[PDB]
């Protein structure tokens with residue numbers, strides 16, 4: 318076989334899960350957050366996949 | 373087989389799940405948030421997939 | 428087989444779920460949010476798939 | 483088989499769900515929000531798929 | 538088989554659900570929002586699929 | 593102060609919420625159920641406050 | 648002060664929430680159930696407060 | 703002070719929450735269940751407060 | 758002070774939370790269950806407070 | 813002071829949390845369960861407070 322990509326690719330066979338991202342956010346997984354009190358200014362309480370590039 | 377992509381591709385066979393994103397947000401997964409009190413200015417309480425690029 | 432894409436594609440066979448996004452938001456998954464009090468100015472309380480690019 | 487796309491495509495066979503988006507928003511999934519009080523100016527209380535690009 | 542698209546297409550067989558969007562909004566999924574009080578100026582209380590590109 | 597009750601009482605001051613029940617059911621709280629398919633014979637799908645005393 | 652009860656009482660001061668139950672069910676709290684498929688005969692899918700005394 | 707109870711009492715001062723139960727079920731707390739597939743005959747999927755006394 | 762109870766009592770002062778139960782179930786706490794697939798006959802998947810006295 | 817109980821009592825002062833139980837189940841605490849696949853016949857997957865007295 319032959320393949321040429323510029324990116325971003327994701328090429329496969331017999332594949333149970335696939336995610337391609339440029340951005341941005343993708344949530345595909347099981348996630349449970351239980352929480353009782355959030356205070357403070359300002360605290361990232363429960364972050365799973367996170368990116369902060371403030372300018 | 374032969375394939376040429378510019379991106380972003382996601383090419384496969386026999387594949388249970390697929391996500392392609394440029395952006396942007398995609399939520400495809402099970403997610404449960406239970407929460408009782410959020411305060412503060414300003415706190416990211418429960419973030420799963422998150423991207424902040426303020427300018 | 429043969430395939431040429433410019434992107435964004437999502438090409439497959441025998442595939443249970445598919446999402447293609449450029450944007451933008453796509454919500455296809457099970458999601459439960461239970462919440463009792465949100466305060467503060469301004470706090471992202473419960474974000475699942477999120478993108479903030481304010482200029 | 484043969485396929486050439488410019489994007490955004492989503493090509494498949496035997497496929498239970500499909501979403502193609504350029505925009506924009508698509509909501510196809512089960513979603514339950516129960517909520518008791520929202521205050522503050524201005525707090526994104528419960529966001530599932532979200533994109534904010536204010537200029 | 539043979540297929541050439543400009544996008545946005547969504548081509549399939551044996552497929553339970555399909556959405557194609559350029560825009561715009563599409564709501565096809567089960568959604569329950571129960572809510573008791575919304576205040577503040579101005580807070581996105583419960584957003585499922587959302588896109589804000591104010592200029 | 594003085595108080596004598598036989599029950600069921602609920603005596604208070606400065607009190608935001610009150611429920612007295614003998615029975616029977618009382619629903620006073622925020623509740624959101626979103627649901628897509630219920631089958632089976634016979635399955636309690638989503639029960640919040642529940643009592644079954646079949647004889 | 649003086650108090651004599653037979654039960655069930657609930658006596659208080661300065662009290663934000665109160666529930667008295669003999670029965671029976673009382674739902675006063677925030678609750679969100681999101682659900683996609685229930686099968687089987689017969690399975691209690693999502694039970695929060697539950698009592699089964701079949702005879 | 704003086705108090706004589708037969709039960710079940712709940713006597714207090716300056717008290718934020720109170721529950722008295724004989725039964726029966728009481729749900730006063732924040733609860734989020736997100737769920738995608740329930741099968742089997744018969745499986746208690748997600749039980750929070752639960753009592754089964756079948757005879 | 759003086760107190761005589763038969764039970765079940767719960768006597769206090771300056772008390773943030775109180776639960777009295779004979780039964781039965783009481784759910785007052787924050788709880789988040791996220792779940793993707795339940796099978797089998799019959800498996801208690803996610804039980805928090807649970808009592809099974811089948812006869 | 814003087815106190816005589818038959819049980820079950822719970823007598824206190826200046827007390828943040830209280831639970832009295834005869835039964836039965838009481839859930840007052842923060843709890844997060846995230847889960848992806850449950851199989852088998854029959855396996856207690858995730859049990860926090862649990863009692864099984866089958867006869």
Ligand SMILES: O=C(O)Cc1cc(-c2ccc(C(=O)O)s2)sc1-c1ccc(-c2sc(-c3ccc(C(=O)O)s3)cc2CC(=O)O)s1
Pocket residue numbers: 339340394395449450480504505535559560590
């Ligand atoms: O609002 C728009 O104008 C954006 C926009 C509008 C579209 C419309 C389609 C139909 C429309 C109609 O019909 O009206 S409008 S598509 C689209 C975008 C796609 C991808 C974008 C990306 S991808 C990326 C990075 C990738 C990798 C990085 C690293 O590694 O740093 S950064 C940034 C951006 C943007 C940014 O600068 O934030 S914007």
Ligand SMILES: O=C(O)Cc1cc(-c2ccc(C(=O)O)s2)sc1-c1ccc(-c2sc(-c3ccc(C(=O)O)s3)cc2CC(=O)O)s1
Pocket residue numbers: 359360361371414415416426469470471481524525526536579580581
């Ligand atoms: O970068 C920041 O400064 C903003 C910022 C920064 C935070 C940090 C947290 C931890 C940090 C650390 O630890 O470093 S930083 S939270 C936060 C914001 C929350 C909500 C905002 C809203 S909500 C809204 C509208 C809602 C409804 C409208 C209608 O109807 O028009 S407009 C606008 C905005 C903003 C705007 O465009 O003005 S900004």
Ligand SMILES: O=C(O)Cc1cc(-c2ccc(C(=O)O)s2)sc1-c1ccc(-c2sc(-c3ccc(C(=O)O)s3)cc2CC(=O)O)s1
Pocket residue numbers: 634635636646689690691701744745746756799800801811854855856866
């Ligand atoms: O003790 C057991 O055997 C029962 C049992 C044992 C399990 C184990 C799991 C792991 C174990 C291990 O690892 O050891 S054991 S799960 C389970 C049951 C689930 C649901 C049941 C239902 S649901 C229902 C009705 C619903 C609706 C009705 C209407 O409308 O009348 S009646 C009745 C029953 C039962 C009945 O009274 O018959 S029993």
Ligand SMILES: O=C(O)Cc1cc(-c2ccc(C(=O)O)s2)sc1-c1ccc(-c2sc(-c3ccc(C(=O)O)s3)cc2CC(=O)O)s1
Pocket residue numbers: 669670700724725755779780834835
């Ligand atoms: O259905 C009923 O008949 C029971 C029932 C019915 C009532 C009604 C009220 C108004 C009604 C109307 O108006 O119609 S009916 S109250 C009540 C019960 C309270 C407490 C009970 C307990 S407490 C306990 C244990 C405590 C500790 C143990 C260890 O350590 O082993 S076991 C068991 C039981 C029961 C059991 O054997 O399962 S049952």
